[PDB]
Structures are given as C-alpha cells and as structure tokens.
Amino acid sequence: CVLLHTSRKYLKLKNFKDGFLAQASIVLNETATSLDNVLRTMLRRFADLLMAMLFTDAGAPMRGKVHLLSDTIQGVTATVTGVRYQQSWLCIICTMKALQKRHVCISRLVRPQNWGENSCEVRFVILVLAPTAMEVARTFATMFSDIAFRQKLLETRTEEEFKEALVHQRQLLTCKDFVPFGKGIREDIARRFPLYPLDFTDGIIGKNKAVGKYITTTLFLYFACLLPTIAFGSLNDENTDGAIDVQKTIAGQSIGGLLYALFSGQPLVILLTTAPLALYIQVIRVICDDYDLDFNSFYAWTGLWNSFFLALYAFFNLSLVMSLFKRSTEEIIALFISITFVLDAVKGTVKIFWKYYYGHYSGQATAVLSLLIMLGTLWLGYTLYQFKKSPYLHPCVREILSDCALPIAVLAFSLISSHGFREIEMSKFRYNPFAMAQIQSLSLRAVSGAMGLGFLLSMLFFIEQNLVAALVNAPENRLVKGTAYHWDLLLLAIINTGLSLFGLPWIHAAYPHSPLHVRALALVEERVENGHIYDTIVNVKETRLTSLGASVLVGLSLLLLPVPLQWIPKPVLYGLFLYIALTSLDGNQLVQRVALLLKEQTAYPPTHYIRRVPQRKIHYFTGLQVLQLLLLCAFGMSSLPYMKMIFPLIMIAMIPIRYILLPRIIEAKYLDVMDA
Amino acid sequence: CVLLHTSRKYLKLKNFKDGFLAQASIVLNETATSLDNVLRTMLRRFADLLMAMLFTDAGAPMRGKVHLLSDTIQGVTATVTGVRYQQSWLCIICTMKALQKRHVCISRLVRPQNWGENSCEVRFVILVLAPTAMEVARTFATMFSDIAFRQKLLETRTEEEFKEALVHQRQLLTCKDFVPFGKGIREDIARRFPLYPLDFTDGIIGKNKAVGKYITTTLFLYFACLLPTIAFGSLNDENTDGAIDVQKTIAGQSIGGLLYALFSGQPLVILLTTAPLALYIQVIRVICDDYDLDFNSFYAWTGLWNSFFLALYAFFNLSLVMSLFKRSTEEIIALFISITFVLDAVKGTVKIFWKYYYGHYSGQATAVLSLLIMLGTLWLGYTLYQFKKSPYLHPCVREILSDCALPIAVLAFSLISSHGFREIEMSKFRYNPFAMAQIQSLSLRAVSGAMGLGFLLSMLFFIEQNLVAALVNAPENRLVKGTAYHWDLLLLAIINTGLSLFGLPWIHAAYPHSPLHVRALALVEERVENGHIYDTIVNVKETRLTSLGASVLVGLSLLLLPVPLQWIPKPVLYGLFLYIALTSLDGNQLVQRVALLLKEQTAYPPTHYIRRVPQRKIHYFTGLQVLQLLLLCAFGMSSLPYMKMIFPLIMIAMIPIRYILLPRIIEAKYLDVMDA
C-alpha cells in the first residue's frame, strides 16, 4: 500500500462586486468513458505527458498505482443527513512551471460519469492549468455552483452559445392573521389566475419541448390513479355492501381529478381516495346499519357538512396554522396510513381464507393461490420500485422501472392468475351494470349526527390536504408559481359536495402520488449517497395537461370495466395495497429511527443527525412518536364505530402535543436537529 | 454552499533502516460515538478550542457548516476493482504554532465507527499535534499500515501493553515437474504432519480462546451440510428410483466428512454432494436401466475406476497444471452449477404440478402451496443472506443472519407448510427404514463402460476438488499452514472408493461451503465500498474441530430421520436449491459483466477494470464466456445420457481454450486486466 495525504480547505465564493472567460476552450458532448481519455481530449483541445501530472501517480505513470486526482474543487453543503457534495461538476487544478500562460478548459459530458467518491455524477469538468490557478478555479467554481446555471449550460448546443452563456452569467453575478374574511382565497386567485395560459403552455411551446415527458407522465398518472382507484372501489364495495361500487369510484375519481386540474391553483396535487377515507366510509356504513338510516342520504348529508366546514376553514384562512405542522406528525400519519393499508390487505386475505379455505360460504386451492398472488405482486412491485435507487442502471431504465413497477406487476400477476391458473377461479370485485341522494328524507337527529361526523371528516380533510399541498410546495422543489392553499381547499369542498350528493366516494390530495407526480414532471440532478440515487429537483414544469389527461383517461376507462379490468383479481388489489404501504415509507425518518434499534449508530455518516444527537434522546423521541402512533391506531382501527370515528380528533391533537409537550420533555435543540 | 479544496499527495512509507513512541498517549476502549467527543477526550488526555481547528470549519465553529477533517492520512491500494482505502485506521494531523512540543495520541475505539467516506470502519485514530508533524504521522502510518500489527494492537488490554507492542513493532521493522512419482503426496504429508497437534490445539489453548467461535461455526457447518445433504438425498432418490436414499446420503456425507477432517491436509475444505454429481448419478441410472445392468454393481465399478484415476492423478502430481486455471473458467463452471440447481428445482416443481395439479397420478391446492412454499423459502433465505452486506447492522447481527439464513428459512417454512397448512398434505421425500455392491457380478463390457464413465467422473472430480482447494488456499486468506493438493486428492479417491463400494453417493469439495467455512473461521476487517460490507481476512484459525464436529452431528442426525427432518417438504428442498444457486453467484464477475448490458459503464468507480477496458472488448469476452457456458449447458443438461455424460470432457477442454484461443482473439493486456 501507499500512504495518501488528503488536505481539505475552504474557498470563499468569488465576489464579483473576463479574459480567461473568452480564452477558455469548451468541449461539448464528450463520449469518452474513462478519465484518461477525457483529460487527453481536453488537453489536446488546447493545441502528451501532461495528463500524468494531474493525478497522484506523478513520476510512476507506467506501474499500476492508485490513480486519483491531485487538486480538485467541488460544491459542498451541510445538512442534518450529512455532508452533501455537488457531484454534477468538478474543477481540476494543476500548477505547472513549464507552462507560460494560464489555460482553462470546460468539458461537458454526454452522460454523467462517476469521477470519484463524491463525484459519482460529474457532467462538467473544469481543468485549469497555470504557469494563479486558485483565482480562476475559484471564480469558475462560483459560477458553476449555481444550480440553474448548470442546467442553462446543459441547454446550450454550441461552443459559442456556451461561452455567451458563461459571459452573461458572469455579468449577471456582478394571531389576527385570520381576521380578514376570504383574504386567502382572493390572494390565491389573484396569484394563480394570470398564470393560467402559462400553466397550459409551459412545455407545448417555447425553447423547451416537453411533449414526450408530458406523455410519459400522463401514462404514469393514469395507471397509478386507475389501479389504486380500482382497489379502493373494491374495498368500498366490500365495506359498504355494494353501496359504492368500483364504477362509482372510477367515475368520482375522474370527475374530481378533471375539476381539480381545470380550476385549481397548484395543479400538481393529485386527488385520490385514501385508506382513512375508506375507514370513515365504513364507519358511516356501520352507523347507518345500526340506526336503520339510508346509507345514501346519511352519506350525502355527512359530505355536505364536511364541505361546509371545509369552506368555513378556507374562508377564514385557517390553513396558515398548518405552518406549525412538523415532520414528526406527518410521518406518524403516514405510518398510520400504511398500517391501515396493511390491515386492509390482511382482512381481505383473511376473508378469502375464511370463505374458501375453510368452506364457510377447491376452496383451499383458491385461498392458497390468492395468498401467493398477493405476495408475489407485492414482491415484484417492490423490487421494480427499488430498482429506481440503483446508481448503475441507465437513468431511462431506472425511471421507467419506477414509473411502471406497479402496473407491470399488476398486469403480470393478473395474467398469471387468470391465464396460468385459469383452472382455479377466485374472487373478483363486484360489477353490476349515479342517482342523487335523497337528502330531504332524513330526520333532524340524523342531520345532527351527520353534522358531527362531517366536522370530524372536515378536520381529517384539512390535515391531509394541507399536508400534501405543503409536500408539493416544498422549497426544495423549486416551484416558481405561487401557492394556493385556501382556494384549493374551497374547490375541494365544492367537488366533495358534488361527489357526496351523488354518492360517489370522497377524495383529497394523495400523499404517495403528488410528490411522484412532481418528480416525474421535474428535472433532477442525480446524487449517489451510500450507493443510492437521490434526486435534486432543479425545475418543475408545472402544467395541468398531465393531470387533465390522466383524469380523462381514468374516466374513459369506464368502458374497459366489464370485459377488461375485471380479470384483475382481489388478491392483486391487496398486493397493490401492500405495495403502496411499503413504498409510502421511503423517506420516513420514524421508520429509520425505529430500525435504528437493530442498526449501528456509529455506522452513520459523521455529520448525520443520528450520530450528533445522543442515542438516549433519539430513543425517547422515537418512543414518544411510537406512543402517538399506537394511540392513533387504537382509536382509528378498533371494532367500535363510535371510537373509530374519533381518530381525526387525535390527528388534530398531535399537533398541539408536538408543539407544547415534547419541547418540555425533550430539549428544543435536539428536536430542531431531528425534525429539520 | 461552500467551495472545498481537496489535495491528495503520496507519502513514502517510513524507512526504519523513539522518544515520541514513549511520549505518545494511548486511549483504550473509547465509547464515544461522535468525532467531537472522541477528539475532546484525546485532547484532554494530553493534560478546549483546539478541537475546532482540526476541521475545515476553522473560524466559524458555532454556525452549522461542513464538519470535515483537514489533514488526514490513510492506507490506500490499487486493484482491478478500484482504489481500496484502509478504513480500519486514520491519522489526523494538526500543525499549531501555539504549541511548543510535539504531541501524539493513539485512540482505540470499542466499535468501528464511520469517520468519513473512506473511513467507514475506523478503529484506530492517531492524532498528531505539532508546534514536524509530517515525519511523526508518516512513521505512525507506516507502523499502522501493517494488517497484522493492527490485530496485535487490538489484542492488547492495557496502555503499557499497547506501548510495548508499538516499541516491539518499531524495533522489528528496523514440463518435467510430474516426473517424480509420488513427490507431491510425500511433500504434502511432510508439510502437514507435524502440524497435526497444532491443527487440533489452535483455539482451545493459548493466548486466544476460540471456544465460542468454534461452537458457532460448528453449528453453522452442521446445518449447512445437513440441509443440502437432505435436499441432495431427495434429488438422488427421485433420480435413481430409490437406489440412493436420504439416509444413504446422510450416512455417506457424515463418514466422508469425518474421514476428510481427520486425515487430510487443509481441513477447511468441506466435502458435499453437488448438482453435477447428481446429474452424473442420473446418467448412470439411465444407462443401467437401458442396459438392464444392476445399478449398485455398475455404480460401484464406476466409483472404483474414478478413484483409480484420481489416485493416478494424485501420484503423478497433475494438480500442478491447475495453476493454469483462470477465473473465467471457474465462474463459467459456477454459473453452470447454479443453472443445474435451478433446473433441478424447476423439474421438481413441474413434476409436483403434473402429479397433483393435473391429477396425473385437492391436488391443485397442493401444487399451488408447493410453488408458494418454494418461492417463499427462496425469498426469505436470500433476504436473510443479503442482510449480511448491510453496513449499518451490528457485526454480530449480520454475522448471525448470514450464518442462520437458510436454516431459519427452512425451519420457518417447514412450520408454515406442516402446521399452518396442515390440511393440505403434500410431497415428502421417501424414507424406508448399506450392503456392499456385488462388483464381481458384472460383465467385462460393463466393466469397460464403467471404466470410461469413471474416467470422465475423475476428470470432473479433479477439476472441482482442485478449484475449491485453490479457493480455500487463496493468498488473500492468510493461511500460514501449507497447501495439500495431491494428498487431499488421494484421500478423496480412497473415501470415494469406500463410499461407492457401499452404494453411497459421491462427494467432493463444496464450492459454496468451503469459503463460507473459512470466513466463519476467520477474523476480518470490515470495508464499506458502494454501501456494501466487504471482508478482508487477517487470520484464519485453521482447526479440524469444526469440520469433525459438523460431520459427527450430521451422522448423529440419522436418529432424527423418521419423526424429525421429514416434515421438511420437497418444495422446501427445491427452495434450498434455488437459494444455493442464487447465493453462489455473489462475486461472479461473469454475472456482473452479463448484467453490465443493463447497467451503466460510466457509473463504475474511475479505476474499475470495467471503465479501464473498452466496452467492446468487455462485451466480446462476455460473449465468449456465454458461448462456453451455453455449450456446457447443452452437453451437460440434455435428455441424451450419452451426451450428458460428456460434459466433464468439455469442462477440461475449456481450460486449453482459455489458455490458447482467447489470447489470440482478445488482446493479452485486456484479458489480464479482466481476469485479475
């Protein structure tokens, strides 16, 4: 072995408040795969024994030794996760006494190439030869450290355009809030009204064409909204004894998505039915059965009261308090939703076994095949989804696999269970081939009960919709257009009134699908941390065409319901539920901290928040979060409808708990470190 | 973000051909988890505002910035895989003008702690403060760069012992080969005879006690030899129409393992039946059925001829030519073995479906449950095995998971399929509760045929045994005791004669279990490359107690045949075959190159052999290897016994092909880079 001396030092960003800009040599579309070839081409561009000195193996270039660059500059940032390097660019420096004049070469690679640790996705290489080099390297790093400038340089097609862009960039671098009634809605409408044409003409016309990306994301959204829509329709049909069918769920989802895409601010939010909504509909069905009330009328009245409360919240600008919402409560809610998905799948398979395996109406074969198909669908979907994080696959391959993991698994296992195992008939969701509910035919006592239930549902809707909207409107997503929280809530209430009046299932912003929609509709910079791909969004196109097309396709899918879309057996839908439950915990810090018990604290990056905070306080915070999650499960997943209807109240209550009690029992600094 | 300047430079290993050795301060068993605490303790040991200067965030220690060490020294080596850092130690340097005298502090951590990017498993921290620092840091790095010296320092218990060890280490650092008949056997016996007591008294007595490690590895070996032994016994019973039972396979494996452990050199090699051996036994059964020859007599004669040829090879010292063996041929053979395992599992499940699902004697339920159990066993075993590579799990946790993955999966799914699904009876391996074969009652023509078949089997045995022995005797394993190839081959021939005379299935060195046995019986230094744990063996204990105990336990397991060990259904054994097939390709470079078509070449480390070699030549080599593998599969996996009996010949032929033809069509430099 050979000893290596690594020296790290800061460099102040150049303060612009040039000759080498014009004298720089630009290489575009470099197809070389190795560092040696790229550097040889870059050096030849100047006009060789000069490439050898660039690395540590200076003096013994023939013998096989460690081949590492000597002087490099990169962008670095500090975060709770650790030290994140800007791996999209690299600046190599070489001070050669033989040379007489400074030389600068900027090379843009066709594809991102690993160029070392913390440079796994280099696309720009800035080689600076000096006869100092420090000043030129610092100024070029300062110019290249901008996230948008790198994308602008990527968009350039010619060397002259590259130099002009560089010159242009250098020159350029040189309480009581709720008192106003309806202020938030008016502000959101004013913000997002003038941008409507823009929203509809972002990628269709202009310098950048997004037709292919728009089509691909439209297909993604259509599939990822239809398949969960079918699963939720089947679940509701099982829960409501056929009151809400799969056809009703599909129609409601299509209408709601179309209305939201057409007439909402922040169109990137996707409306879909959720597991807690199914649980609450089950609560309504149980209450109606107990009190002999018509399901349709009671459901319509509950939806009407929920929409009324949501409109009251929107008009009074309550959404602002959602700024106090922290990540811990969000992750607790997400884990509860995943647990509800898992329990729905388990209940479905248990019912299948009870009806078929135990003969409580060849049933054993059907039950075993159902279990096998559900587990296999889950496994295949999870594997195809996790292939997205592989840093060695082509970007196209690992974005198609992410895009078409669940659809591929569903199709493959539907074929397996309907053609490979056609001799074993199994369960399929009901389909009997939209009348307004008789709201007037209901007692006043039932109206008051619906009022209370709608209040609880409105709290649930407020929390969920604002959570997903905040996720979509995160600062790291780089959304130029303004936010629309109150107008979005009002439109959600309106469309929910419309859906409830016709008995269609409720819908709100979908947590798993909205960030996925944003990512599919965004340009990202690949980052490799611990052998996994992480995406840094640079530009989101922010168009309504994708959501509108997805909604229209989902609506048109009603014609494929009888003959197609029914060969998908119920176990495939349960596997879809399991896949959603597992894949909704990708960035869950609560799950990470829970697993930390089985992991090693000292194995995390030196600057990771886990290592920074004492393990005792981390465990205390995890225990408090787990206690909150257990209490949420206890109320919101019991057999008692009267106590299953209360879980929105405790969802509201956790926010005051996190805001008040936890800082009193846990130090504020540690909570700030963990949450951020 | 803040620009970072990384400077890399060589440092010549100190040439010893001291005061600071005695003046150094030693800290032992440091339980601190963060860098700040460790460095604070180390600085306090001298007797604070000095810890801040050690990192790049000098001048702004309060504001949250990137917290990286400034001057660090590490051990680095170059390999075809890439640049491998010595992550077990780190030397931090700080030149402070305030200080008046040099200071050195050596801290040993209780557990390996990530301390960087290429410092994921640091256990020794050498902090050098200077008022130069370069000389002291270089000499300490040179002393610590030794792999065995780090283990010796770990073994020390007190500061005085640590200093004495440091001082002692510093002082210390200051053709025609086959003509002799039987020379190899005599040399091996002379080498390995005096070390017998040592072999039996390595960890039992002395400074280091290995009782716990010996017990754990004995349990691992027992389970990993019994379960595949049962699977192979069932496969042979299916193939040979009950001629070779599971009881016979267990007895033969136990006797052979005991004999090999007792009276062989290099006892770390594990003898077990293999898939090609099962295929060849099937060939023998088919030939006997075709020619109406007694299976036992023909099998015994074939084994006798195979042993005679193996003894001839051992006495004439042919094993030496195995040095010409390359990694490409080894990996082709391993992939062929895995494919044979997969086809055996597929044939078993196809037969189960044909008998039960199609009723060609509730069968559909049994077939579907068989498929589900096999797939689930494969999945669980693979997951528990792959958890071994997680860099965040505790070393004990991942070591146990690797040790008890297959046994845990087998037990869990046997319980599931025998208790959870007890209503669905399914296939179980035959067991009817050891007579010498009537060799004298066989025709001369059958004797000549058995001679030819035994010649082919002897070539197969030579290749397989020498391959596994070379894997066990790899230089990187650090085996102090000498190698024994010819004596091992002679003993293998003797025990094979003994086994064949009684009709027991043949056995030779097991490729998947011998390296695993070595690893379980070895101390390793953890390395994290691309987020995966890689082990560097420092010391292998090299004892026969583990293999002897495993063989004795396997033999004693015959008493657990009737009531235990039969609830394991055949699909569990097929899942075991699949698990072995998938887990035998961990380091397969042929599989890596085949998958490279779907991967990105530029995403590999800069110094990886994949990027160094042009992709065209990599693809040509992969295509040639795949063609050889396809020919091997075609000959050794067809329905014709006369052509299924020839695959050992082409296994032999592939070595001349690799040695002669490939260098002619592919450049020698690229082949050397890829193979090494």
Residue numbers in the entry:
A (entry chain A), B (entry chain B): 105 to 121, 131 to 160, 173 to 256, 264 to 306, 336 to 522, 569 to 640, 645 to 887
Describing publication, verbatim:
To further explore how PIP2 participates in the complete substrate transport process of BTR1 and prove the connection between PIP2 and pH sensing, we attempted to solve the structures of BTR1 with the R125H mutation or wild-type BTR1 prepared under acidic pH, which may both disrupt the interaction between BTR1 and PIP2, and succeed in achieving resolutions of 2.96 Å and 2.94 Å, respectively. These results suggest that the disruption of PIP2 binding site and acidic pH can both lead to the dissociation of PIP2. Analysis of the TMDs using HOLE2 shows that the substrate binding sites of BTR1 in these two states are accessible from the intracellular side, suggesting their inward-facing conformation. Disruption of the PIP2 binding sites (BTR1IF/R125H state) or acidic pH (BTR1IF/5.5 state) both turn BTR1 into the inward-facing conformation. Protonation of PIP2 under acidic pathological condition or pathogenic mutations exist in the L site of BTR1 lead to the disruption of the interaction between PIP2 and BTR1. Here we suggest that PIP2 may participate in sensing the intracellular pH by changing its affinity to BTR1.
BTR1 (SLC4A11) is a NH3 stimulated H+ (OH-) transporter belonging to the SLC4 family. Dysfunction of BTR1 leads to diseases such as congenital hereditary endothelial dystrophy (CHED) and Fuchs endothelial corneal dystrophy (FECD). The TMD contains a core domain (comprising TMs 1–4 and 8–11) and a gate domain (comprising TMs 5–7 and 12–14), resembling the arrangement of UraA25.
